[PDB]
Amino acid sequence: TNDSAVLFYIVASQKKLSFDYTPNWGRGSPNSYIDNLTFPRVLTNKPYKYRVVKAGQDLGVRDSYSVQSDGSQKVNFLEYNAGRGIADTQTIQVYVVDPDNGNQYLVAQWK
Amino acid sequence: TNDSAVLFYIVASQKKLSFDYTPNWGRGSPNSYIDNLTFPRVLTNKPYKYRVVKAGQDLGVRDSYSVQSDGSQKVNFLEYNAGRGIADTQTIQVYVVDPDNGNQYLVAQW
Amino acid sequence: TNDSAVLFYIVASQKKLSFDYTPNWGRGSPNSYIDNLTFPRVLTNKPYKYRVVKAGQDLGVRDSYSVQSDGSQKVNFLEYNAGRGIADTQTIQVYVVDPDNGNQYLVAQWK
Amino acid sequence: NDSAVLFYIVASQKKLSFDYTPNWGRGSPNSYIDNLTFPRVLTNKPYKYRVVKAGQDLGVRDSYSVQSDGSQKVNFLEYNAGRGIADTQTIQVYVVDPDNGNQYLVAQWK
C-alpha cells in the first residue's frame, strides 16, 4: 500500500503533471435529484469521453463538454438519462473511456 | 520508456506473478472465420468476465468458461455473435472486466 | 505503449495530484559551476531525501531543505560537495530517497 | 485496488512470470543468514543487488548466474567479507535498475 514507485514513474515519465478528479455533484431543482458531475482539473493528454452507469444500468457514452479555462470538465447526466437527472437514492458510476484502446477507468461513484 | 519501477512495485505487493495473454485465435469451418480466443495462463485473483467488440460494435459481456487445469481460458465468440464467427476482415477487441469496479482493460485485438 | 491505466490508477488512489519536477539548475560564481537544483512543485506526501552522484561518484544522501511556500524545493550541491559547486563539465544525477523503504528514483540528470 | 496496474503489465508484455518470494539460507551456526534465493527473477535486464546490513550500506556486487530453474541467489558472504549476517541485524536487498540507477527493495529481514 505504498505506491511511491508508481508516483515517481509518472514523475519521470511526464516531468510536469497536475490533475484533480474530486467529485462535485450538482443537484437539481428538486434537490433529491443529482443532475451533473464536475471535475476541477481533468487530464487533457487525450480526448476522453465518459460513460455513466445508473444503478447498474449502462447509460452509454456521449460527447464530452469542452474543458473550460480553469481546467474543469463537467458531465451532464441529463445528456445520458433522457433529459432527467438521477435520483440520489440510486448509485451512479462514471468511467473515463480511453479513446486509444477503449479501456475504462472508474473516476467517480455516488452512494 | 522504462517501466521497471512498475514491475518492481508489483513485485513488492505480490512477490509471485505468472500470466500469459498471448492471443490464440482459433479459425472456423471456412478458414476466414475467427471462432474463438484462448489465453494460455490468465490472471485468477478475481472472477473476470470478457467483453467483445466487433468492428466498433459492442457484443456485450457473457458468462466465462472455466479456467482450465493448465491455467488456460477460452473466449468463444460464437457465444457473443449469436453462434457465428467473425470474418478476418472485421476488427475484434476483447476486454477484461474487473468485477470490483467495472473497469475494462483490452487484452486482445485482431 | 500507453500508460493511461497507470495515470487513472493514481486518480483512483489519490483524487488530487500535482507536481512539477522540471529541472531549474542554478549556476555559480563562475558561470560553469552548477551549485543547486530547484524543482517547482515537489511531492509532499513524505519528507523525501536526495542523493546526488557527481560523475558516477556517490556524494551521499542529505536532509532536504524545507518545501517552500510555492511548493518548490531546492537541493544545494554545496552541502554534498564539501562547500564547492560541481563543474558543469561533469554529469550529475539526483535521486529521491523514499524514507520508508529506502528506494531511490531518478528525478533529474545533467549533461 | 491495483488491477489497473496489473493489466498494464499484461498489455505491455503479453507473457511474463516472476517470483521474488524470499528463500533465506541459514549458516553453520543457525543464528546466521548466509544468502537469499529468489525462485524466478526478472531477466529483461542484468540486475544487480545492493545489501544494507543494519543501516550499513555494503555496496553492490556482480550478480550470480541465473540458474536453470530461473532462480538467482544473493550471497551475503560476498558482501560481508566472507561472513554471514547475524539474524539479530536488519538486512535490506535492493534491485539496481542498470538503466537509470534506481533502487527498489525486494527483500527485508526482521
Residue numbers in the entry:
A (entry chain C), C (entry chain D): 4 to 114
B (entry chain B): 4 to 113
D (entry chain A): 5 to 114
Which statements did the authors publish about this structure?
The double-glycosylated wild-type is denominated by WT. However, we only managed to obtain crystals and solved the structures of WT, N39A and N5+39A. Since all structures turned out to be almost identical to each other, we used the structure of the WT as an overall model for the analysis. Specifically, the composition, as analyzed on SDS-PAGE, visualized that the double-glycosylated band of WT represented only 6.7%, while the single glycosylated and un-glycosylated bands accounted for 31.7% and 61.6%, respectively. Unfortunately, none of the structures contained a density indicative of N-glycosylation. The lack of glycosylation in our crystal structures may have been due to the nonuniformity of glycosylated protein or the flexibility of glycan chains. For the simulation, the GlcNAc2Man9 glycan structure was used, as this high mannose-type glycosylation modification is commonly expressed in P. pastoris. Figure 3 shows the obtained crystal structure of WT and its predicted glycosylated form. Based on its crystal structure, N5 is at the start of the N-terminus just in front of the characteristic α-helix and located in the middle of the tetrameric structure. N39 is positioned in the middle of the third β-sheet and located at the four corners of the tetrameric structure. Double glycosylation significantly enhanced the pepsin resistance.
